[PDB]
Design a protein around this ligand. Sequence first.
Ligand SMILES: OC[C@H]1O[C@H](O[C@H]2[C@H](O)[C@@H](O)[C@@H](O)O[C@@H]2CO)[C@H](O)[C@@H](O)[C@@H]1O
Ligand SMILES: OC[C@H]1O[C@H](O[C@H]2[C@H](O)[C@@H](O)[C@@H](O)O[C@@H]2CO)[C@H](O)[C@@H](O)[C@@H]1O
Lengths: 384, 381
Amino acid sequence: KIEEGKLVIWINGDKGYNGLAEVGKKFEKDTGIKVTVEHPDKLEEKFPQVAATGDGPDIIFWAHDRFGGYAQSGLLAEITPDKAFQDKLYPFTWDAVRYNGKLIAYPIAVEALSLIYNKDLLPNPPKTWEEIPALDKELKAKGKSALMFNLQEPYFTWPLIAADGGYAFKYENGKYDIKDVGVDNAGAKAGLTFLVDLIKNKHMNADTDYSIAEAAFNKGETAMTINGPWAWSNIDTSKVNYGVTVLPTFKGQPSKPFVGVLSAGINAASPNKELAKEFLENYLLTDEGLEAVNKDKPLGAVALKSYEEELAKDPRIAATMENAQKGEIMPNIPQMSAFWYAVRTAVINAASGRQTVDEALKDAQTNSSSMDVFMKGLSKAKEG
Amino acid sequence: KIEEGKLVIWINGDKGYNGLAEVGKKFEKDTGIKVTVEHPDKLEEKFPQVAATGDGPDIIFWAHDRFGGYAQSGLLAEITPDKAFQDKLYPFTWDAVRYNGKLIAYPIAVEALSLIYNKDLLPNPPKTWEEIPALDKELKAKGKSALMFNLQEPYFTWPLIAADGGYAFKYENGKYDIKDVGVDNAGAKAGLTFLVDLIKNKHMNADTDYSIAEAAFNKGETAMTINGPWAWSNIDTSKVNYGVTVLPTFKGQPSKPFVGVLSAGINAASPNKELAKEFLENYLLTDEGLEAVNKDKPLGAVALKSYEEELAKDPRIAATMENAQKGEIMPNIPQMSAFWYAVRTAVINAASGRQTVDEALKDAQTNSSSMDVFMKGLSKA
Ligand SMILES: OC[C@H]1O[C@H](O[C@H]2[C@H](O)[C@@H](O)[C@@H](O)O[C@@H]2CO)[C@H](O)[C@@H](O)[C@@H]1O
Ligand SMILES: OC[C@H]1O[C@H](O[C@H]2[C@H](O)[C@@H](O)[C@@H](O)O[C@@H]2CO)[C@H](O)[C@@H](O)[C@@H]1O
């Protein structure tokens, strides 16, 4: 039930959908093709539901990590950029959208979490996670707090969990060993334990989510938050005097944020595979195109080589690059979808105390690599 | 023509039929029902014949792909396991034995081909199909070869044929579309052409079969073979130092072996349906039963959740699982049998040079397709 002759695009609500719509406007002014941008909830869970029935958007935007599962279920069209166009993007970014030997999406920008901080509340950001409790105690006396960030998504907690030796899937001999999962080793337990103690000692609250943390930071209630380039625009609007810097170290080790590549995939069932290709290659992935989106919500280190000068005027991107170098590229393998759900459940359970750290992380490793998982993987590859 | 009171079971001669026999011995010791295990040649062909006339075994073991056709001909009783028992097996495996809504057999184990290599001849197995010719050239100078596997059954060549885009029947929405066959596409042609060139340049021989490839690998004459878990037992006996690994890629994409679920179906003409059911749920499909069979010839990744223990340790099973993920589950539609004959013919013909690859797959495409549809199409005068 995908209408032919018009483009429909899904992109997350935290990203610059309005700017992207503006790119859709010029496309229409040129082609007469109506471009419709939407930002549904749980769109990364929606898409495979609807695409497995031949429905959905023409173009889906998401970080590269989930496109492997999609491709595995044949939900994504293979993209066909000529050598000329490939030479316009950094090879690393193409690599991120390569699954089972095929390009499964157009890469847009490299994303990584950074430490964002209020300079008026905190002229010098803390170098270590360890000093944060004491820092919060001081700010509490001023009716402020040290740190608020989204605790409902493992994406935001991962930098701390991976710091002392946490890892998702081991990478050996040019492949991800889908049975060597590092979410239950000593490093992970240490990172998550520090997070839980922060909550035990009332320096953070288990129920803090994206909206709550963002409001608190943008209204000057808390000295720090943890977020990506997309978040900067709302801070610009808040007039809070903020800096963007390297994440704090844990046990002397750098925080390790997952590196994501925002990517645009083409629905396998789309009747407009050719229109999608011209929009993405000729309209979006251009200086003017990316700028329009970046002006709405900053993209990060974009895939387009030619944007480098423009990005060089932005110290925030420097901080993004520094945190990216210290992090690990997200795998795009199909078992990623179950990894996330597993870690999500663990972080939330440890945080709320429903489970201990040892317990939560055991179940996390069990639910991300096991015979049960592989088996469901075999049926998921057949349906989704 | 099927005697009541005792159980006759059919299972392929490459599986653990002696192991199975033992399970029947612990059955005969608890009920008094004499259990007979037989492993007839062309068994997948003989069951539908004999069982149509009310003869044949009480229980047939075969990969799930055949069972769709058996069911449609009313050769299989519907099995009635309760929620309690169904919970003991992985839901993926129950799916494989589901036809037109009804469960038509008990799933036993998940099968997939892997690359098997001799570590002494070949410390690091090749990552791509493409480097095999050069490898074979090196090995030939030592009086050895790179690769031998069974070229008489399309099952063994399919992983290569599927790699770049070949497929049996298209699965879209929730069903297999019988009018969307993929044995004739560019990907199929590319893979079969590669296989044929291996043969043309003498890296392999068109007439190599299961026995020949097995003896060659198990005697240390060839560095690699392609085979399933059932084969490991003989390699163990051979004392060859071997590993089991992910199939090589072709054109940068993984080989896509078919995934099979070894299943046990109950003859619809059997007077012993209740004994057969008990034998399967209470004897075979337990830890102690699956071990007996497994110890004879490994089964692969067994359907029984509780066995997960042993399987986790075995990296051969891991390789198997790895290959299974990259592969495609065999359809079970009645048309599969015709599909198999057609592709068997095409591979054998392309391999021998009786037909070109293009010609061979064109015909395989046509003949894999449904005669009913062909005949209806002629109704368009
Ligand atoms: O929390 C699990 C979640 O993490 C990542 O999602 C990020 C996304 O990459 C960012 O672009 C941004 O929108 O924040 C998201 C977290 O809320 C993974 O990409 C995603 O698949 C995963 O579920
Ligand atoms: O070659 C066609 C053949 O492929 C499959 O047979 C496999 C079977 O699944 C394995 O368990 C093992 O016995 O090797 C066989 C190949 O010789 C299909 O299951 C079968 O129906 C088909 O004839």
